[PDB]
Design a protein around this ligand. Sequence first.
Ligand SMILES: Nc1ncnc2c1ncn2[C@@H]1O[C@H](COP(=O)(O)OC(=O)CCCC[C@@H]2SC[C@@H]3NC(=O)N[C@@H]32)[C@@H](O)[C@H]1O
Ligand SMILES: Nc1ncnc2c1ncn2[C@@H]1O[C@H](COP(=O)(O)OC(=O)CCCC[C@@H]2SC[C@@H]3NC(=O)N[C@@H]32)[C@@H](O)[C@H]1O
Lengths: 235, 234
Amino acid sequence: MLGLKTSIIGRRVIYFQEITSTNEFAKTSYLEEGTVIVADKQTMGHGRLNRKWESPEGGLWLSIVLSPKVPQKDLPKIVFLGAVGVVETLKEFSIDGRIKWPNDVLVNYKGIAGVLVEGKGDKIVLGIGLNVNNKVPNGATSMKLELGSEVPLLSVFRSLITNLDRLYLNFLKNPMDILNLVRDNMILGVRVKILGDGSFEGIAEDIDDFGRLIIRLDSGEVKKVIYGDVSLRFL
Amino acid sequence: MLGLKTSIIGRRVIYFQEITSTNEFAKTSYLEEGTVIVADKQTMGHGRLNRKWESPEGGLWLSIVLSPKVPQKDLPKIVFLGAVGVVETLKEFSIDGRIKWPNDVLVNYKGIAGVLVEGKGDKIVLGIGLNVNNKVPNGATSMKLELGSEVPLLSVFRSLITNLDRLYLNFLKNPMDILNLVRDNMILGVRVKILGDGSFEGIAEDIDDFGRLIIRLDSGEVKKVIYGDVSLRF
Ligand SMILES: Nc1ncnc2c1ncn2[C@@H]1O[C@H](COP(=O)(O)OC(=O)CCCC[C@@H]2SC[C@@H]3NC(=O)N[C@@H]32)[C@@H](O)[C@H]1O
Ligand SMILES: Nc1ncnc2c1ncn2[C@@H]1O[C@H](COP(=O)(O)OC(=O)CCCC[C@@H]2SC[C@@H]3NC(=O)N[C@@H]32)[C@@H](O)[C@H]1O
């Protein structure tokens, strides 16, 4: 009854009034590529390192099952597909979303969405949490808070799915194309702190041909950051 | 993201851009009670006796998984829940649907919807097909044809699911209530032709406590139909 016209993402959609986590359900269940798992609310939503992700009613909490036929070295770019898709949807609604490497989308430096990719061989789960009409943690923001009015949740869903399908199809043909889109929508030219085994500060200059964040430390030393066990903090 | 407020029916909804049949999927897949299976289009839609149910884009083709812990003899009333739900939804959109025993809904005698209930040991599948904006077979009709304008398919889905959830919850407590709602919205007091071997004609008088169609033949004989097809124009 939804009338989706996408090629892969959205071929099937499983909706839940409530769920523990769409990412956990997607990883665990036997599902076809392109299947979207969406819930009004999550009781155990999570971010990276099982950090908690608040998922109250009013937001868009979903996961997409993918089985990308691309070299193993390109799978780390899947997170960017989600981030860019969210940015394009926000722009369609006249909201200036910007990417905080490598998985977050901010509006005026306030978190409005997050992307979590979990992979297991031939199966990749692309999870996306976007604040629309829901209440949010202090510091975060939402489409409703940004626009000053409630936003039809289903319209945002249709927008995002349409964007993701297109981005995904192009990624399968040209895995590198997504990097240019990230670059054009990412927060760069500012000082950031990288937190992992220890930490260092520098200017976030750009992302390289592998999607690694390039940081120039005050000494002039250049570091290439691989996302995985590190987080980014703005100064 | 649909924000359904129903208690049982619609707790989960599985949507397909295309499928063979929502009833078939529902029967062969383990699904919690209340799960709704819906598709934009079916390539092998089914009617009774495996008749074909045209299910092109624009209509509402769905199946609901049920597991009612009620007496065995009340299970034949599930089809009525689907029929009455459709009638209620049609009324909300200013359309007067009438039930043609035991599973069809007609508007001015043209078929607009059909119900197919299939029992399984593990569950009961309530299948409902309703013409909204799609092209229909000659002799049939749709909400769009009746209203003269495109009808928001999702609005119809929300309405129907809401009505069914309410009807089902009450059915679990007062299983006989559905019968009167059926009598109130069924085509009666007219001559009909019951089909199958031993075909016969007579006045469709009412339905009994088991949902059987009561027919009065011209001889005065009274027959009770458990299942079969009724023709209002022959
Ligand atoms: N609703 C919210 N809006 C903005 N920030 C939030 C938030 N909830 C939590 N946060 C903050 O974001 C931090 C984590 O951000 P990270 O970058 O580590 O982790 C993420 O940003 C990824 C979040 C992915 C959530 C989606 S919802 C659908 C799918 N199912 C899931 O269970 N997860 C995915 C938390 O520690 C909080 O500081
Ligand atoms: N789309 C349509 N609209 C009005 N009449 C139709 C129609 N398609 C077929 N018909 C006519 O109705 C007859 C069958 O009516 P019956 O009363 O026997 O059988 C029915 O009326 C029940 C139809 C149930 C269809 C739903 S769609 C979702 C679920 N999954 C399925 O595969 N099926 C269910 C066909 O033989 C045609 O004569």
